[PDB]
Scaffold this active site. Structure first.
Site, PDB file in Angstrom:
ATOM      1  N   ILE A 152       0.753  -1.235   0.000  1.00 39.90           N
ATOM      2  CA  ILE A 152       0.000   0.000   0.000  1.00 39.90           C
ATOM      3  C   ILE A 152       0.800   1.311   0.000  1.00 39.90           C
ATOM      4  CG2 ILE A 152      -2.355  -0.634   0.719  1.00 39.90           C
ATOM      5  CD1 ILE A 152      -1.293   0.295   3.591  1.00 39.90           C
ATOM      6  N   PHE A 162       3.837   2.955 -18.553  1.00 39.40           N
ATOM      7  CA  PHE A 162       2.410   2.902 -18.284  1.00 39.40           C
ATOM      8  C   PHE A 162       1.705   1.914 -19.217  1.00 39.40           C
ATOM      9  CE2 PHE A 162       0.141   5.158 -21.578  1.00 39.40           C
ATOM     10  CZ  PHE A 162       1.207   5.752 -22.274  1.00 39.40           C
ATOM     11  N   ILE A 178      -2.519   1.012 -20.199  1.00 37.22           N
ATOM     12  CA  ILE A 178      -3.954   1.305 -20.154  1.00 37.22           C
ATOM     13  C   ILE A 178      -4.690  -0.020 -20.409  1.00 37.22           C
ATOM     14  CG2 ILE A 178      -5.797   2.754 -21.049  1.00 37.22           C
ATOM     15  CD1 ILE A 178      -3.411   4.491 -20.231  1.00 37.22           C
ATOM     16  N   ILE A 179      -5.641  -0.375 -19.551  1.00 34.86           N
ATOM     17  CA  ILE A 179      -6.521  -1.516 -19.776  1.00 34.86           C
ATOM     18  C   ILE A 179      -7.917  -0.965 -19.803  1.00 34.86           C
ATOM     19  CG2 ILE A 179      -7.258  -3.810 -19.025  1.00 34.86           C
ATOM     20  CD1 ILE A 179      -4.165  -2.066 -17.594  1.00 34.86           C
ATOM     21  N   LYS A 194     -14.326   2.937 -28.311  1.00 35.24           N
ATOM     22  CA  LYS A 194     -14.872   4.315 -28.165  1.00 35.24           C
ATOM     23  C   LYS A 194     -13.816   5.398 -27.970  1.00 35.24           C
ATOM     24  CE  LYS A 194     -18.485   2.155 -25.302  1.00 35.24           C
ATOM     25  NZ  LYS A 194     -19.075   2.347 -23.957  1.00 35.24           N
ATOM     26  N   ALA A 203      -9.197   4.639 -24.667  1.00 35.42           N
ATOM     27  CA  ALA A 203      -7.780   4.344 -24.580  1.00 35.42           C
ATOM     28  C   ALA A 203      -6.937   5.591 -24.812  1.00 35.42           C
ATOM     29  CB  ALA A 203      -7.392   3.241 -25.556  1.00 35.42           C
ATOM     30  N   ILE A 241      -2.639   5.002 -32.643  1.00 31.52           N
ATOM     31  CA  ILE A 241      -3.104   5.926 -31.593  1.00 31.52           C
ATOM     32  C   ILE A 241      -1.915   6.586 -30.876  1.00 31.52           C
ATOM     33  CG2 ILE A 241      -4.194   6.052 -29.262  1.00 31.52           C
ATOM     34  CD1 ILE A 241      -5.859   3.496 -30.346  1.00 31.52           C
ATOM     35  N   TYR A 242      -0.927   5.774 -30.453  1.00 28.95           N
ATOM     36  CA  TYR A 242       0.199   6.310 -29.705  1.00 28.95           C
ATOM     37  C   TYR A 242       1.094   7.161 -30.612  1.00 28.95           C
ATOM     38  CZ  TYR A 242      -1.387   3.481 -25.756  1.00 28.95           C
ATOM     39  OH  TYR A 242      -2.123   2.982 -24.716  1.00 28.95           O
TER      40      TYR A 242
END
Ligand SMILES: [K+]
Ligand SMILES: [K+]
Lengths: 166, 173, 166, 174, 173, 174, 166, 166
Positions: free
Chosen positions: H44, H78, H80-81, H89, H92, H126-127
């Site tokens: 944590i 990083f 993204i999921i 849509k 992402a 996209i990237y």
């Protein structure tokens, strides 16, 4: 002038070398010395077993073990182990007397008993002369060196002792 | 079998069986050779010994209800022996459950645990149990004199035993 | 048909409300209920004291405490506390009998004793009729409510009991 | 008799002070203590402490004339099924003198006569005909062939599993 | 072989090798992905990670003396890969030990650990190391731009790799 | 295609809430969690907690139509030797419907395609010809016969060890 | 040829004797050496502070402390302490240069700053010549030897450093 | 109006069901939900990874993971999921923008990078449009569903970002 004194950590190497055959400390097995040390530490305040070095003329000659001490039923088992180099001198019977003294006169027990191999007539005879009666024959109770051995349980009680030796 | 005590089985003791255990009895009782009186003490000891294989316990159940306890204690696999005790709830005595459960205890010790010798201890004056165990094939090995102080007096007990050969003969032709 | 059963955690609120005056659990003081709970948990396997709820017709009527149990010297002190709402019905003497049964016939003790205020002649009389002899007068042994009180120690032994009540 | 030829090879229980000896009996092949891997000496020591009361494995130093010559490991001791695997390691400086077979006999004595086991077995590389022959002469029968069971030094090796039972032992060595 | 760098071997890192490790170097160093500067920090981390198999270390020794370190890190047995770094003590540079040790690292990863891919990272301007690894059969897979801030500037690194087939061919005919 | 016959048997990772199901899949035969025995449910729970991050065993509930029908256990996962043992247990109420073979296929998929193993094997009683036949048809060859290897219900039973390799799988099922 | 090396446990006695005035280890006070040792152990992996022994010709001459390291805001405070026996030789400025090297070129910080007594014009001058600008005057910020002292905060940034010294 | 918020324990069931394929929490594998919970508790306060639930119109639509945060070298990876039910849509790319905002404008990083399958041209495109350049092709870097897959590493830097999006 053989006497008993309480087992101390520094007596463990002596204990370890009195003997291939399973040995128990507080009903827990050990082979290596390190295992014996660890168990000795782990059980230091447990009063269910008590041990004494037998010593004569300041040299260590054996061990007394009282185990399964139960104060409600007022009994204990005992075992005498004599160092092989001090066997055949009647230290066993001298130490058995001291074990009896301790169990009956300090611990306030009513019954002491012991286990011996059926074929150990020499020990059976010694214990009969000290006042022990045979109470049982435990058949094939221990696997030792490839075969099941039979043992004799023998016992003596606190009134007959605090008469005959007091 | 059909019109008879028929549906008796053994299952492993579970935590939720302890209240049942606690109420089967005046007399010191032991869990892993450690005494208890209060239920709380029994619970604590039960937790403390959960993976110790030196004792094993089974609830005896018939018709879905709990009727007793089997205790194998002093299990030693080098010497290949164990002691056992059968305790039947007083409300289910006199229906042959003791002998039914004794048979199951023998099955378990000899056929699952691979033991060579099972034995038991009973009061010398418990002729009912002595008779049951003699009929099951147990021979008397020992009379332990004044071995338990119970209710103000020293009682004498009979040790009885049966071996894995005489069992896998008499119950396994 | 009064009987003893072992004290359980769920009996503590009952215990706490039987009484301003120091109370002890395993020789450790407590006032608040929380303190009593904590001590109860801390001492759960200690056999030097044993406690029993006295119950009759399923209702809780008091407490028996055996303390200073020593199995080598084979003795214990006991105290009976009766809920104030059930006093004056001879439950004290009924419970004292049960405490004697337990100490002598289950615990295998040789001597039980108890302490009572010198000025509690009613209790002194009850215990004399049950077979207790006076062994001592402990002078100014407890400061209670501003003054030093004197107590009588009374005892009975296991042979005279396993005769007279057995 | 006075005129026997006898070895004074014996087994004694492994002790903490034996670990440096153990460690140098072999970076090249994975070694296991209670089924847990170690390479460094420090790792071996740690595992040794961690498993000291566990009876599922038992170890003995093989010693002759008071010098340490090898190690016996009984592993997977199971007393319900009454069996154990064993491994003999002989120090490279004491190989070629039949200590392996002498120690295997002692391991058998211990497993069958002290531990009360019914079956002992071992694993050896299929291509180690010398060891296979030794174990056949001691009374071990072949029970099977584990194919491509260990990746060692870049290749998948096949091993033979060999076994002897408590009856065939308490016959042939009594 | 006879008249040559010949006696180079690898042995497992031990606690008593840490002072040697600490003095091989200005630059952050990592033990199980955790940073250290002081020797005390390195000792503490060494203890904390002793049974973790995700990194393995070997002292390179020749003629009995310690000459360097091999580090395999990010060992992943599902993907069957690891990164490695060879560090040669500055006092033993220029004697072909780097390439000798690289061969031993490859032997260990492919033949003992059963890995499929080993890779390494070196500064783009470390032509000496790039050349050694090209001759050993490593292909360049990646140029990671400005991937480390070292001594006041962002440096670019080359990732290089070799696979278990090309190894057990080129060094195992 | 729309007109296939297909089972919706799948495997999902075992969770704590699956243990009561696990416990009642069999007092009569010793069961092991991370090579540690258990009988009582409480013992199973304790061991489950104690071993939660240990990757040397992996378990899956077999489920079809959303109901739990059995358990897959891969044990002795070793990634250096690239192998694992597996055991299928089918709930007695769902036996005789070829779920064992369906689940064995899924276990193979997982071991070879997710875990990257080279060899999977299993153990079955020599007298279980029905299971032996199923595993032969799935591509498993017999590698050996472990004699009197388990004491079960009063007698020493013999088991067959069967294996399949990552090449013969990524052929026959691709 | 003055250099920095990482502080080690065996440097603590040296640290303890560089000075009556409160000293801090990870923002926790200490006076006794034992307290310093305990705090040193307690904070061994904490990267919020870093310390270096300044050494020249193999002898220990002082200490560098970077504290309040924050990598999101990319800054740290630093303090140079020179052993009184090695003062007046411009080791302070030599060590300040090394502290700058370390913070900007190894730690990748954007800003370093420091605190000095307003009346320490000698140190203020040294830091001005190294490129530090004054950013603040903290009024009566420390009670020292009976009086409230005022301090100057001074700072330098990473671009001006990686130009002027690189 | 998609936004990021910090991952909370109560988001784990959502995380667990976004997927057969190994998943990692602080570089430690998990399959079962219980394993994920245990690892979540265990890590944590570890700042080497940070996670954010992507949410739009109050519903949870995916996860952002920054891992291998290193503040000395000033970089992070990083991932993204996106929940399968909210794919197709452009969430992402919206979330990638937010991840960039966070890494460069809150964490003060200099470089962010990511890994994608070589055959995922849609994500690669996209990237590229967001300003990421390709830095590497890691060959046969992951065994997935029976075969070794090749990945593209892509990166963008903090100056080009604090220009083009600021
Ligand atoms: K194994
Ligand atoms: K195993």
């Amino acid at each position: 002038s053989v006497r008993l004194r309480p087992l101390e950590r520094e007596d463990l190497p002596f204990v370890h070398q009195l003997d291939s055959i399973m040995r128990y400390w507080f009903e827990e097995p050990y082979e290596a010395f390190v295992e014996l040390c660890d168990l000795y530490d782990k059980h230091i305040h447990d009063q269910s077993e008590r041990r004494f070095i037998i010593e004569s003329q300041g040299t260590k000659i054996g061990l007394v073990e009282l185990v399964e001490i139960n104060h409600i039923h007022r009994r204990a088992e005992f075992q005498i182990i004599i160092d092989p180099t001090h066997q055949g001198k009647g230290y066993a019977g001298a130490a058995a007397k001291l074990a009896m003294e301790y169990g009956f006169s300090v611990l306030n027990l009513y019954k002491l008993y012991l286990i011996v191999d059926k074929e150990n007539e020499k020990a059976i005879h010694i214990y009969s002369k000290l006042g022990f009666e045979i109470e049982g024959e435990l058949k094939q109770e221990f696997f030792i060196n490839g075969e099941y051995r039979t043992v004799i349980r023998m016992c003596i009680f606190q009134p007959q002792y605090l008469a005959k030796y007091k």
